[PDB]
Design a protein around this motif. Sequence first.
Motif, PDB file in Angstrom:
ATOM      1  N   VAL A   1      40.244  42.244  46.450  1.00 55.60           N
ATOM      2  CA  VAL A   1      39.061  42.906  45.933  1.00 55.60           C
ATOM      3  C   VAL A   1      38.749  44.080  46.820  1.00 55.60           C
ATOM      4  CG1 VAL A   1      36.590  42.802  45.370  1.00 55.60           C
ATOM      5  CG2 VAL A   1      38.063  40.776  45.001  1.00 55.60           C
ATOM      6  N   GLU A   2      38.641  45.234  46.181  1.00 56.89           N
ATOM      7  CA  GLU A   2      38.293  46.460  46.860  1.00 56.89           C
ATOM      8  C   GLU A   2      36.791  46.417  46.944  1.00 56.89           C
ATOM      9  OE1 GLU A   2      39.902  50.110  45.602  1.00 56.89           O
ATOM     10  OE2 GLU A   2      41.656  49.170  44.691  1.00 56.89           O
ATOM     11  N   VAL A   3      36.312  45.860  48.039  1.00 60.62           N
ATOM     12  CA  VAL A   3      34.896  45.704  48.292  1.00 60.62           C
ATOM     13  C   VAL A   3      34.128  47.001  48.391  1.00 60.62           C
ATOM     14  CG1 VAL A   3      35.343  43.534  49.352  1.00 60.62           C
ATOM     15  CG2 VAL A   3      35.205  45.566  50.793  1.00 60.62           C
ATOM     16  N   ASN A   4      34.819  48.126  48.259  1.00 57.42           N
ATOM     17  CA  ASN A   4      34.149  49.427  48.290  1.00 57.42           C
ATOM     18  C   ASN A   4      33.516  49.686  46.932  1.00 57.42           C
ATOM     19  OD1 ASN A   4      34.513  50.431  50.897  1.00 57.42           O
ATOM     20  ND2 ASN A   4      36.440  51.454  50.415  1.00 57.42           N
ATOM     21  N   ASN A   5      34.054  49.027  45.907  1.00 55.12           N
ATOM     22  CA  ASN A   5      33.552  49.228  44.547  1.00 55.12           C
ATOM     23  C   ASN A   5      33.141  47.954  43.862  1.00 55.12           C
ATOM     24  OD1 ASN A   5      35.118  51.734  45.055  1.00 55.12           O
ATOM     25  ND2 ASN A   5      36.834  50.532  44.270  1.00 55.12           N
ATOM     26  N   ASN A   6      33.677  46.828  44.316  1.00 54.46           N
ATOM     27  CA  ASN A   6      33.393  45.549  43.661  1.00 54.46           C
ATOM     28  C   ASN A   6      32.965  44.405  44.585  1.00 54.46           C
ATOM     29  OD1 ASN A   6      36.213  46.724  42.021  1.00 54.46           O
ATOM     30  ND2 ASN A   6      34.334  46.412  40.798  1.00 54.46           N
ATOM     31  N   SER A   7      32.434  43.360  43.966  1.00 46.93           N
ATOM     32  CA  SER A   7      31.979  42.179  44.668  1.00 46.93           C
ATOM     33  C   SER A   7      33.055  41.124  44.804  1.00 46.93           C
ATOM     34  CB  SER A   7      30.817  41.544  43.919  1.00 46.93           C
ATOM     35  OG  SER A   7      30.476  40.296  44.505  1.00 46.93           O
ATOM     36  N   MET A   8      33.076  40.486  45.969  1.00 50.46           N
ATOM     37  CA  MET A   8      33.997  39.400  46.251  1.00 50.46           C
ATOM     38  C   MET A   8      33.691  38.193  45.333  1.00 50.46           C
ATOM     39  SD  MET A   8      36.278  40.191  48.576  1.00 50.46           S
ATOM     40  CE  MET A   8      36.983  38.589  48.676  1.00 50.46           C
ATOM     41  N   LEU A   9      32.445  38.065  44.868  1.00 52.39           N
ATOM     42  CA  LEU A   9      32.043  36.942  43.997  1.00 52.39           C
ATOM     43  C   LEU A   9      32.668  36.879  42.595  1.00 52.39           C
ATOM     44  CD1 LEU A   9      28.283  36.686  44.839  1.00 52.39           C
ATOM     45  CD2 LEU A   9      30.189  35.360  45.848  1.00 52.39           C
ATOM     46  N   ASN A  10      33.331  37.956  42.193  1.00 48.76           N
ATOM     47  CA  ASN A  10      33.954  38.006  40.886  1.00 48.76           C
ATOM     48  C   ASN A  10      35.145  37.075  40.840  1.00 48.76           C
ATOM     49  OD1 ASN A  10      33.045  41.421  40.779  1.00 48.76           O
ATOM     50  ND2 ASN A  10      32.287  39.840  39.380  1.00 48.76           N
ATOM     51  N   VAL A  11      35.725  36.798  42.008  1.00 49.91           N
ATOM     52  CA  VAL A  11      36.877  35.906  42.122  1.00 49.91           C
ATOM     53  C   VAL A  11      36.550  34.464  41.699  1.00 49.91           C
ATOM     54  CG1 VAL A  11      38.687  35.028  43.647  1.00 49.91           C
ATOM     55  CG2 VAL A  11      37.776  37.305  43.964  1.00 49.91           C
ATOM     56  N   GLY A  12      35.319  34.042  41.974  1.00 52.39           N
ATOM     57  CA  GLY A  12      34.907  32.694  41.636  1.00 52.39           C
ATOM     58  C   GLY A  12      34.459  32.525  40.206  1.00 52.39           C
ATOM     59  N   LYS A  13      34.276  33.631  39.481  1.00 52.63           N
ATOM     60  CA  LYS A  13      33.835  33.577  38.091  1.00 52.63           C
ATOM     61  C   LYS A  13      34.903  33.192  37.069  1.00 52.63           C
ATOM     62  CE  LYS A  13      30.187  36.965  38.675  1.00 52.63           C
ATOM     63  NZ  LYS A  13      29.355  35.751  38.984  1.00 52.63           N
TER      64      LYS A  13
ATOM     65  N   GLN B   1      33.804  26.585  46.861  1.00 51.41           N
ATOM     66  CA  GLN B   1      34.439  26.369  45.557  1.00 51.41           C
ATOM     67  C   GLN B   1      35.953  26.092  45.714  1.00 51.41           C
ATOM     68  OE1 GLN B   1      35.025  29.055  41.370  1.00 51.41           O
ATOM     69  NE2 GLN B   1      33.562  29.721  42.950  1.00 51.41           N
ATOM     70  N   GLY B   2      36.467  26.138  46.945  1.00 53.49           N
ATOM     71  CA  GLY B   2      37.888  25.882  47.198  1.00 53.49           C
ATOM     72  C   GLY B   2      38.839  27.085  47.266  1.00 53.49           C
ATOM     73  N   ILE B   3      38.276  28.290  47.252  1.00 51.71           N
ATOM     74  CA  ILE B   3      39.000  29.550  47.283  1.00 51.71           C
ATOM     75  C   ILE B   3      39.027  30.088  48.712  1.00 51.71           C
ATOM     76  CG2 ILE B   3      38.963  31.927  46.361  1.00 51.71           C
ATOM     77  CD1 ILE B   3      37.373  30.862  43.990  1.00 51.71           C
ATOM     78  N   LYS B   4      40.216  30.259  49.275  1.00 52.09           N
ATOM     79  CA  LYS B   4      40.362  30.790  50.635  1.00 52.09           C
ATOM     80  C   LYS B   4      40.026  32.293  50.633  1.00 52.09           C
ATOM     81  CE  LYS B   4      41.984  26.811  51.927  1.00 52.09           C
ATOM     82  NZ  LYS B   4      43.141  26.681  52.892  1.00 52.09           N
ATOM     83  N   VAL B   5      39.513  32.804  51.755  1.00 53.26           N
ATOM     84  CA  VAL B   5      39.139  34.218  51.887  1.00 53.26           C
ATOM     85  C   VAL B   5      39.760  34.863  53.129  1.00 53.26           C
ATOM     86  CG1 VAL B   5      37.284  35.900  51.979  1.00 53.26           C
ATOM     87  CG2 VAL B   5      36.912  33.708  50.757  1.00 53.26           C
TER      88      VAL B   5
END
Length: 265
Positions: A10-22, A77-81
């Motif tokens: 995720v290019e955190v310059n334009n988007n949110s890291m939270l979209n991955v969990g959706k 949620q079980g997603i590594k970062v």
Amino acid sequence: KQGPTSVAYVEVNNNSMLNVGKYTLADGGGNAFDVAVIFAANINYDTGTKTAYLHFNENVQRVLDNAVTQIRPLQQQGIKVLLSVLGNHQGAGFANFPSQQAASAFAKQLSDAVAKYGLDGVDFNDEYAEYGNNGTAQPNDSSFVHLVTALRANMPDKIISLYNIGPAASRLSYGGVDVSDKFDYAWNPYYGTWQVPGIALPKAQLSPAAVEIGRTSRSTVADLARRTVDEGYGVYLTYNLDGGDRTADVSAFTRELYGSEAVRT
């Protein structure tokens, strides 16, 4: 759910890291994404002291500072970062550290942020390092090996991954030590293509497929994902998940990897 470990940068310059969990599977309900990667911190170059330093742009810093809402939720949620680090056109690259202590000092900066932000790991991206800019030196045989050896030593229980690209990727062995086994993962950097990484990692830890969500054709997303399973590979790299409704792009791959369509919530 069972199948390949899906990764999402995720290019955190334009988007949110939270979209991955959706995105979760319509069937079993597991996550559509297993690993989330923050794109991306930089290896900076101080031309006065002639030393490299770690750098977080404002958006990357903001994400890190707010780990409580941006990173932690995904982990629960079980997603590594992971935090990806890339070179800049400043001259400092992962393959031109002039010494072990040089290579180690930077390694120390990586595990300190990892320990400090509750990250599960670091990803190396030897792109955009323009060796020789600002008078920096060209790559050598030792640098990468000294840095990976130190970082791994600093964090034996965290994930360390590599984007199969740049002078560093081809410099895993020196002074006897081959660092290939210090990596948990390695992935193809060429979106929309299938390219098996040379790093000596088992197929289960390699991702020959690379795709960009929203750019790569869903036809290609599906094919590369099917191919990942056909060939017995265990990782599937995805790049640039944004905040739009990418349920179709996401299903194009989960269907192949997991046999289920994805569902955005």
